[PDB]
Amino acid sequence: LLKFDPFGFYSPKLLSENRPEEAMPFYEDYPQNDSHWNLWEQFPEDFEDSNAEREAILKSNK
Amino acid sequence: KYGENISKHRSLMSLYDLHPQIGYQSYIAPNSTVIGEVTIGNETTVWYNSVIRGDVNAVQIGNNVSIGENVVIHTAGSLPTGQPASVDIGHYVIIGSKSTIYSCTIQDEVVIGQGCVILEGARIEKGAMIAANSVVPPGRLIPAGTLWAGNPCTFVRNLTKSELATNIDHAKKQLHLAQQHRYEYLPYNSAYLQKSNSEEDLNPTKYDDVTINYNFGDEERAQENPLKY
Amino acid sequence: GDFFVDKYNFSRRVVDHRQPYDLNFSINNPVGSRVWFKAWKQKAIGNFLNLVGVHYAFYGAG
Amino acid sequence: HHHHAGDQADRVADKIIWINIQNRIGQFERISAFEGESLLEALQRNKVAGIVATCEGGEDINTMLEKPIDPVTYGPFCSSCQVVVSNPWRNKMGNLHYLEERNLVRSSYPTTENSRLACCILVEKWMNEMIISIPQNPNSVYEDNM
Amino acid sequence: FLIFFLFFSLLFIYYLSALNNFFWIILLIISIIGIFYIISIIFDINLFKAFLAYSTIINSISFILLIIAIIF
Amino acid sequence: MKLFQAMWTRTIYSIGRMVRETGLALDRYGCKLEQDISCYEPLSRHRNILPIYDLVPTFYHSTFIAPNSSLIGAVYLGQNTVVGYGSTLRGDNHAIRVGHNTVIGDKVAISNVATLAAGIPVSTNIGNHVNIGAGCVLQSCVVDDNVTVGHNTVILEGSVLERGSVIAPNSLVPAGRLIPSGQLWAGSPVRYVRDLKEEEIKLNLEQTEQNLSIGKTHKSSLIQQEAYDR
Amino acid sequence: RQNFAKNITTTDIPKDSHHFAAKRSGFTQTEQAPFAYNDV
Amino acid sequence: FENVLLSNRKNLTPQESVQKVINYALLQDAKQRSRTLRHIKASWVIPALLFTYPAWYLAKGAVN
Amino acid sequence: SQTFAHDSFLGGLNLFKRRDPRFVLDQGERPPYPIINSNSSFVDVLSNFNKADFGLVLFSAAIGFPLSRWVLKGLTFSSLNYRRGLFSSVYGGVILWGLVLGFNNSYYRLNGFVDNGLVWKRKERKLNKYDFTSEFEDNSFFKKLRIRD
Amino acid sequence: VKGKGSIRKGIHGEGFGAPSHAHDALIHQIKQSKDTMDYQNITNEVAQNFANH
Amino acid sequence: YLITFNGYSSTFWWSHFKLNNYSLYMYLLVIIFNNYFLYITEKHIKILNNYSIDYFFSIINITLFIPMIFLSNTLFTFFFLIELVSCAIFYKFIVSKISFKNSNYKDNYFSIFSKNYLNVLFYQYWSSFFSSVMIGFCIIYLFS
Amino acid sequence: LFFMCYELLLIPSFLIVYFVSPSRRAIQASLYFVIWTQLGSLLVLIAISYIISITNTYEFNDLKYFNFTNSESTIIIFLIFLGFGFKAPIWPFHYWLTKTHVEAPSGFSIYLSGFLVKTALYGFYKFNTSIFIDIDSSIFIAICIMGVVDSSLKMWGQTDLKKLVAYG
Amino acid sequence: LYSSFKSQYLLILFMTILNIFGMYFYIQNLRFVVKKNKSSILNYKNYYVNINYSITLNIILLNFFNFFGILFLSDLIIILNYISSYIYI
Amino acid sequence: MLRLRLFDAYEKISMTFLGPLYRRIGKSLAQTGLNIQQPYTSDDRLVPSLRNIRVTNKIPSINDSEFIAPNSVVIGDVITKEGSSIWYGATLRGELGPIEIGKQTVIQDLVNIQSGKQNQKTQIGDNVFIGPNSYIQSSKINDNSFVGMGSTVSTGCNLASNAVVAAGSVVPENTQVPSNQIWAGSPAQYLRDITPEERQVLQEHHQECVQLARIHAEETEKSFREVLNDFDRITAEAEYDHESLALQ
Numbered sequence A: 001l002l003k004f005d006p007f008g009f010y011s012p013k014l015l016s017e018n019r020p021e022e023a024m025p026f027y028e029d030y031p032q033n034d035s036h037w038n039l040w041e042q043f044p045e046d047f048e049d050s051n052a053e054r055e056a057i058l059k060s061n062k
Numbered sequence B: 001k002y003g004e005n006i007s008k009h010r011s012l013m014s015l016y017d018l019h020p021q022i023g024y025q026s027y028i029a030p031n032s033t034v035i036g037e038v039t040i041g042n043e044t045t046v047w048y049n050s051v052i053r054g055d056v057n058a059v060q061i062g063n064n065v066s067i068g069e070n071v072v073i074h075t076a077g078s079l080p081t082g083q084p085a086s087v088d089i090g091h092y093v094i095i096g097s098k099s100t101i102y103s104c105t106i107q108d109e110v111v112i113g114q115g116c117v118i119l120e121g122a123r124i125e126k127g128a129m130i131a132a133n134s135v136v137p138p139g140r141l142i143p144a145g146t147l148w149a150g151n152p153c154t155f156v157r158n159l160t161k162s163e164l165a166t167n168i169d170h171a172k173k174q175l176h177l178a179q180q181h182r183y184e185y186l187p188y189n190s191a192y193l194q195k196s197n198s199e200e201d202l203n204p205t206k207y208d209d210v211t212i213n214y215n216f217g218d219e220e221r222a223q224e225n226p227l228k229y
Numbered sequence C: 001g002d003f004f005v006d007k008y009n010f011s012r013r014v015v016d017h018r019q020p021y022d023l024n025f026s027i028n029n030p031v032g033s034r035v036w037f038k039a040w041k042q043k044a045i046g047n048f049l050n051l052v053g054v055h056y057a058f059y060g061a062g
Numbered sequence D: 001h002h003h004h005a006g007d008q009a010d011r012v013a014d015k016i017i018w019i020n021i022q023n024r025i026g027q028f029e030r031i032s033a034f035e036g037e038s039l040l041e042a043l044q045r046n047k048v049a050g051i052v053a054t055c056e057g058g059e060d061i062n063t064m065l066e067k068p069i070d071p072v073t074y075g076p077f078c079s080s081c082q083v084v085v086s087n088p089w090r091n092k093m094g095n096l097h098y099l100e101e102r103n104l105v106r107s108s109y110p111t112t113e114n115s116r117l118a119c120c121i122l123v124e125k126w127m128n129e130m131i132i133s134i135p136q137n138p139n140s141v142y143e144d145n146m
Numbered sequence E: 001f002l003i004f005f006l007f008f009s010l011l012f013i014y015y016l017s018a019l020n021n022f023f024w025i026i027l028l029i030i031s032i033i034g035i036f037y038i039i040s041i042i043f044d045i046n047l048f049k050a051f052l053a054y055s056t057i058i059n060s061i062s063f064i065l066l067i068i069a070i071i072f
Numbered sequence F: 001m002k003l004f005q006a007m008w009t010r011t012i013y014s015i016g017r018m019v020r021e022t023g024l025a026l027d028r029y030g031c032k033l034e035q036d037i038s039c040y041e042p043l044s045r046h047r048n049i050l051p052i053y054d055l056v057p058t059f060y061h062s063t064f065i066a067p068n069s070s071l072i073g074a075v076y077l078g079q080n081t082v083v084g085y086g087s088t089l090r091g092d093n094h095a096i097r098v099g100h101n102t103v104i105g106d107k108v109a110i111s112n113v114a115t116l117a118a119g120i121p122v123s124t125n126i127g128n129h130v131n132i133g134a135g136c137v138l139q140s141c142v143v144d145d146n147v148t149v150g151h152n153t154v155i156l157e158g159s160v161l162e163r164g165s166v167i168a169p170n171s172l173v174p175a176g177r178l179i180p181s182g183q184l185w186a187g188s189p190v191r192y193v194r195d196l197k198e199e200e201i202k203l204n205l206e207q208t209e210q211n212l213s214i215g216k217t218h219k220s221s222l223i224q225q226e227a228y229d230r
Numbered sequence G: 001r002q003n004f005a006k007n008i009t010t011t012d013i014p015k016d017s018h019h020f021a022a023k024r025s026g027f028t029q030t031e032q033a034p035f036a037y038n039d040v
Numbered sequence H: 001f002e003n004v005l006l007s008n009r010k011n012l013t014p015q016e017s018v019q020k021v022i023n024y025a026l027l028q029d030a031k032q033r034s035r036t037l038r039h040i041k042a043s044w045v046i047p048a049l050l051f052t053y054p055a056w057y058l059a060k061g062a063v064n
Numbered sequence I: 001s002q003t004f005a006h007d008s009f010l011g012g013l014n015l016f017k018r019r020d021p022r023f024v025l026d027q028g029e030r031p032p033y034p035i036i037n038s039n040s041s042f043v044d045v046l047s048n049f050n051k052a053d054f055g056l057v058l059f060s061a062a063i064g065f066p067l068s069r070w071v072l073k074g075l076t077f078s079s080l081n082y083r084r085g086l087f088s089s090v091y092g093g094v095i096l097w098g099l100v101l102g103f104n105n106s107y108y109r110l111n112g113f114v115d116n117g118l119v120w121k122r123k124e125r126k127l128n129k130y131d132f133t134s135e136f137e138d139n140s141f142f143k144k145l146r147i148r149d
Numbered sequence J: 001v002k003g004k005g006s007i008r009k010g011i012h013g014e015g016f017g018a019p020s021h022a023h024d025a026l027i028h029q030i031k032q033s034k035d036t037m038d039y040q041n042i043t044n045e046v047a048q049n050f051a052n053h
Numbered sequence K: 001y002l003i004t005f006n007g008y009s010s011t012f013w014w015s016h017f018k019l020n021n022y023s024l025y026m027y028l029l030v031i032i033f034n035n036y037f038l039y040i041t042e043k044h045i046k047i048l049n050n051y052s053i054d055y056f057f058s059i060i061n062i063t064l065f066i067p068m069i070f071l072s073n074t075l076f077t078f079f080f081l082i083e084l085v086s087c088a089i090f091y092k093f094i095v096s097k098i099s100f101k102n103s104n105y106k107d108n109y110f111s112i113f114s115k116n117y118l119n120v121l122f123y124q125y126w127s128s129f130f131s132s133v134m135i136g137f138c139i140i141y142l143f144s
Numbered sequence L: 001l002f003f004m005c006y007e008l009l010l011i012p013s014f015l016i017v018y019f020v021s022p023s024r025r026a027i028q029a030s031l032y033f034v035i036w037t038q039l040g041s042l043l044v045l046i047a048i049s050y051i052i053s054i055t056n057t058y059e060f061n062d063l064k065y066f067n068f069t070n071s072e073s074t075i076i077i078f079l080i081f082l083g084f085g086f087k088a089p090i091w092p093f094h095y096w097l098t099k100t101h102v103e104a105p106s107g108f109s110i111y112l113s114g115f116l117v118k119t120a121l122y123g124f125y126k127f128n129t130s131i132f133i134d135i136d137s138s139i140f141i142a143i144c145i146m147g148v149v150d151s152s153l154k155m156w157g158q159t160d161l162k163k164l165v166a167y168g
Numbered sequence M: 001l002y003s004s005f006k007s008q009y010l011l012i013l014f015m016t017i018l019n020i021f022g023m024y025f026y027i028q029n030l031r032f033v034v035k036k037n038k039s040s041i042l043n044y045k046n047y048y049v050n051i052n053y054s055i056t057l058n059i060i061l062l063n064f065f066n067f068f069g070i071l072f073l074s075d076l077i078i079i080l081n082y083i084s085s086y087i088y089i
Numbered sequence N: 001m002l003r004l005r006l007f008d009a010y011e012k013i014s015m016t017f018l019g020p021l022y023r024r025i026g027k028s029l030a031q032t033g034l035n036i037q038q039p040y041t042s043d044d045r046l047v048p049s050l051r052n053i054r055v056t057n058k059i060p061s062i063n064d065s066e067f068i069a070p071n072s073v074v075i076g077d078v079i080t081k082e083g084s085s086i087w088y089g090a091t092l093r094g095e096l097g098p099i100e101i102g103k104q105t106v107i108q109d110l111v112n113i114q115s116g117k118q119n120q121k122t123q124i125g126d127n128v129f130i131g132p133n134s135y136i137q138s139s140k141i142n143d144n145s146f147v148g149m150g151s152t153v154s155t156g157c158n159l160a161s162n163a164v165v166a167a168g169s170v171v172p173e174n175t176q177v178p179s180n181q182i183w184a185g186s187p188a189q190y191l192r193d194i195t196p197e198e199r200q201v202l203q204e205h206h207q208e209c210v211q212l213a214r215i216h217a218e219e220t221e222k223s224f225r226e227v228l229n230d231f232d233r234i235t236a237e238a239e240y241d242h243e244s245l246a247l248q
């Protein structure tokens, strides 16, 4: 209980959230709150998301 | 003998009344090959460039199985212990890419790492995990809910219920990817329209009596699998 | 020949090798023709030889 | 298993329970089973003849293979997985469940006092070298021949 | 159900309605005996086609009760 | 307006799919009426360029793509990139980006995991002048610049191979690992072996350039035999 | 299981990249490979 | 627009190069996810606009 | 409601025009049209054959061909001779059914059940007290199926 | 094997049943000795048939 | 034919059959349901063929005569119509397929005894016999 | 329409218990819930059938313009009380509630105890208020008080918190 | 409803007994539908499961008239009462 | 017979008129639907046969092989002897170095025979079995050698006659594998001398694989009409009674 710190305010928490083992996949850690009341991913308004890579490659091939 | 421009490869092939069977929502990649008596389950995804030979013995595969690319599954015909030498794969089995399966039993919720060789007589029990680039020696038992790694594989550590549920969830995620890949294919093959008429096509040297058509009643049959012949 | 449009052969045609064995039999010729009459006479004579009393009781009584 | 880190895997041959069978044609078989499975599952995996297994192991919840058997269980749903066990392992099994006995006595073919239902038998380590006989079981419905 | 049982009911309703003074008691006795005879039996079967047949039988007894109410 | 354009695109795509299905069904029906069997030929359905709706593979024409390879979904190949025979690049989940002058061996499977933690890209990014041996399995990795990967090597998700690194054949880089620059790593659990020398670096660069030239020769030979598109 | 996107676009995750320093030299023949991502 | 992956990053330390590649990959993944979400949400609004009034017509005709 | 003129080739379509959904009339109910021969014999019905019944036979012949083909669409493992024989038998059966329909139409015209070119001196006076169909039929296709609205 | 369903062929001969099935001693005797019985061999099947009778 | 049918509410062929609206509606309803079930049966038979021509010919004979029961104006003609229908139903039960092609290769050199066919025939035959004799006795005593 | 809307609450509830519940024992709990609540629904169905057949109407004012005899009113009140007490639940018809609450998912257990039983109460109130009943309600009062006592005396012997809340 | 209209309380009681017993007889099998995994009950034609679209459409129509058939039962009642009205007139 | 004449006339009309008309309309509709769906779609192609690919003057000599998979890849100077088998997904690149496959040699599924050096002959002897998912690199594999599935024979390896590499083993570069010895492990090391029983097992495995390749060659090399006849035969067997089987 003393070392328990899942939110990383007292014990620093990796963005990777865990060190994967040399025999396990890099699965995320289960969150403390498993709520599924999540919206779709929120992007900022006026977000430029055009497929610039594909457009550039097509321009080169054109 | 082997000189032609159009490939003769068929994804599903029979061998002397050994007909493969495939369940609903199962995606066999057109680049993949399934031969002999192979019973694929419902919602099973065999990815590209994978070979499944149920020729010398049958191969039963569970429902939510995901077989990766470059995976060779084949049977041995006989085992030293007298057990059935047929591949029996559990219902939520994630076989990693470039894997080899040689007439072994794999129970449900089993994860096989990429580049793993599971030899003859091996029994991977329910919930087990084999890390990538590992070889299970022939006739070896992997206890249920255990994590192994090595060549030959050695016990690493027991698996928690969270890890087991994570593997189960990873098994279920491939379904919608297979749905997208299926949706990219129309039920009617359009490749026949791109060929040129041949003398054999226009002038059949031999004729056969009219029998039941292989597509009889297909106007009433749902086109659930677009890759069906 | 081969009438390709884009990639589709509009003249694509593979003649079916599955035909009834009696496709060109004499009995399948239009009724009233000499070939059909020959085949039908043979069939009727064979049936009468197999069924003398049946033919008598059916056609003669009819 | 109580495996330790770095321990090698154990042989399947060392974990095999042997069932010696007398088939209806009076022929001696030797099949392999694993603890935790049912005798019906072992017999069907080994393609053992004589077991009709019309209901195919009964219900999937509150099964007869659980320890202890749930009181709300429906028990076996036919009398087609009948195997006559030998005396030692039959005594070790104990007394019949009431539903299993009801299904055994409601069989069109004669039974014995050592008769058990295969899908009601859970394979255990003490069932090694266990002798059973499998005379031909009755066919219940029109689809037993389908 | 559509022919045999329908003609059964019409025998009690239409064709032999003048004999309903004797039909009612026989139908009531048969209905009571069937209800109190099959309630236990429908719960000792273990076959799909037996389930279908007993569904048919239960519906037949219900409709016999209905025609008893009709001939009143 | 962007959602309206997406709706219009999907509506037009669905109308085209309906028209194509109707046409194929009509052709099959005429095939039936003609007593024809051309419609029943079990020709292979494999497509080396399989777009997942809007995830269309994109590559420069300088690339060599094996006819039996399978580029699915969002794949982005740089100039002169060589793709081996039987190699699969599944961009159905996330993009698979490959740099200029990169060689991918035969029977190489590259894919992406569903999700990863924060700061870890779920896309398989491969730098320029990378050489990948045959029989490799890459998952959501980041290989940067002139990296040599031995054959039968498995790179797991979250792995980062830095510029100028060599991984010996029949090895496995585990998930979330880092291979420092200018080092040789070997073994299924990858262990450090030695720092790369100038001779080794030059030999690896020469070998990957030779592989690029061999890929160009393969494309030239396949075009002549009518086994290559365009 | 959770399936949301950790790599949000509305803002940048506040991180400290200096707390953990990945090893880059002096590896032994039996040591494990370092970890690529060490931001906290 | 500059393609960081298809660029001359050899004038930097390997850590800087891999960090730039990671940042570029994250940005392009965000853009791709935005496009995929836009296309997915299009699969909702079209059925909502097209078939909702037929469904309401059916319900109204059946009820009142 | 108007009916197709009898003794034409569309007189058999009057069989599909019914003023009431009843199968038959009552015992003492007068038929819609004057009776020509209530005690009709088989040869009386044959003599009363006309263009309406011939048109019914022609309609059976025209619609019987696609129906026979549809029946044959389920035939397998059959030679060409048996296929042609089965088609001929089915087509002859449909034409015989058309002959039966024409015979029925002639019998009805004899009995006055359908239009026979005759009208009663005084029409039966009926009050359409219960009427759920007049407004529906006057604004729909079904005005052609119900006689006298 | 063509025309024999799931029955397979090994090296020194061809099987008489599906893989992992039960070899019948009576079938082996019939196939090997087509009509030759040196003596009326009383097997378990014959003894059980006599007992049933 | 039923839709275009016309006539008087009366009894035809020596009052052995009744042509009235209710009997004709019962005839039509029986035929309509027979058509629905035959349509579904065809859709099923295009999936897997476990039935022969004789089975569906027996079904054909049932559907032809089973609506004629509702036209009966007498218990005599009704008894004979149900005798014909019971013979057709016995015919249908007779032509059920006995053996199938299955993946059960364990029974090729052993005798498995399935008795459902004989049980069906026995019970149908004896129920028909008892019903027929009781209906005949009832007819004889109703004539009295 | 009142009776039908009362009757439409069974299928979604059984579907929630049968498919959303994680416990393996919840299948039998769903069966018990269905059979008990449907026996109560059958009793209420008999009562409403009496009401509709005797006075051919569907309006409470039309019920106000009609009087039921003593026997008919007694039968109606007994039937409605017993049915809505099957759904209430009342002693001894709370076995289904105990089993379901122990085995149902927590969300449905919140919804089952919180709301549906109140729909049963509303149905009973609407049915009994519109009909003149001349019998003594002491039997029904005794049944309700016996239910209260029986539920209260069993709270000490419950080590399961959800079953204790069910008894409450 | 008709038994109450005909004033048959005993017949109503026996109908209720039969209905409740048969109802548990039917819903008892709903417990058996729980399976540890998805089943394989479809015939295989051309190496894939044969799903008959015509039978599926028939089941769709029957399901519509089974779920929402109470909304349209009045027309069936009218048709059946009209048919039955000919029995004595 | 007027009915039969009408039947024949409509058969001729339907075929010779409706067939071509419906086919033309369907092809036009399919083409325009494909055009509408572009570019967010793909169409079925004609998959090239890559099992006889030549490079400049390097032309395969594989006509003696008893089985070559339709989806296998054989490029360049690859010379195989009589009875050779190359299975599904295998890749033999003779441009990077000559490949010499011996008599009765089995190269199983997804085996990559690729030369590490620019021009080095990869010489596999007679009666040699190579397991699936193997990787052979510029090696000399002598006669009657066994290579297990998932095995990697490196650049300089020399496998003597009757040498066994266990499945999953990776032979190090320049490693000489002696005769009648079994090696195993990711660093391949001498495991044990092979017993005669295991030798017989390996011989039977090789003969079984040779005959299985013969069967697969019989199956995979069927023409389109033969494949259609096989499909019809399978669908007929799906509905054949025991009486029909007895008749056959």
Ligand SMILES: CCCCCCCCCCCCCCCCCC(=O)OC[C@H](COP(=O)(O)OCCN)OC(=O)CCCCCCCCCCCCCCCCC
Residues within 6 Å of the ligand: B219, F015, F018, F019, F022, F025, F026, F027, F028, F029, F032, N022, N025, N029, N032
């Ligand atoms: C700028 C160009 C724009 C083009 C827009 C679309 C134009 C459509 C042109 C249609 C031309 C029709 C020509 C005559 C066809 C008559 C129908 C026919 O022959 O149907 C029979 C056939 C039966 O098929 P089946 O039972 O499945 O048997 C398969 C056998 N192997 O049935 C079939 O094979 C099925 C195909 C029938 C095709 C006609 C159906 C028309 C229905 C009305 C239009 C609805 C919209 C369809 C397209 C979607 C548009 C969003």
Ligand SMILES: CCCCCCCCCCCCCCCCCC(=O)OC[C@H](COP(=O)(O)OCCN)OC(=O)CCCCCCCCCCCCCCCCC
Residues within 6 Å of the ligand: I018, I021, I022, I023, I024, I139, I140, I141, K002, K003, K004, K005, K025, K028, K029, K032, K033, K036, M076, M079
């Ligand atoms: C403005 C408009 C412009 C134009 C728009 C476009 C064109 C519109 C075209 C409209 C329709 C045209 C129809 C053409 C004729 C159709 C004939 C027909 O379907 O008849 C049905 C039949 C007629 O009934 P009826 O005449 O009363 O019966 C004989 C009485 N002598 O009825 C019967 O057979 C009734 C049978 C009653 C008994 C069975 C049914 C009730 C019991 C079962 C209920 C349902 C259960 C499922 C049954 C099986 C369903 C498959």
Ligand code: FES
Residues within 6 Å of the ligand: D040, D053, D054, D055, D056, D057, D058, D076, D077, D078, D079, D080, D081, D103, D117, D118, D119, D120
């Ligand atoms: S198989 Fe049914 S009781 Fe065991």
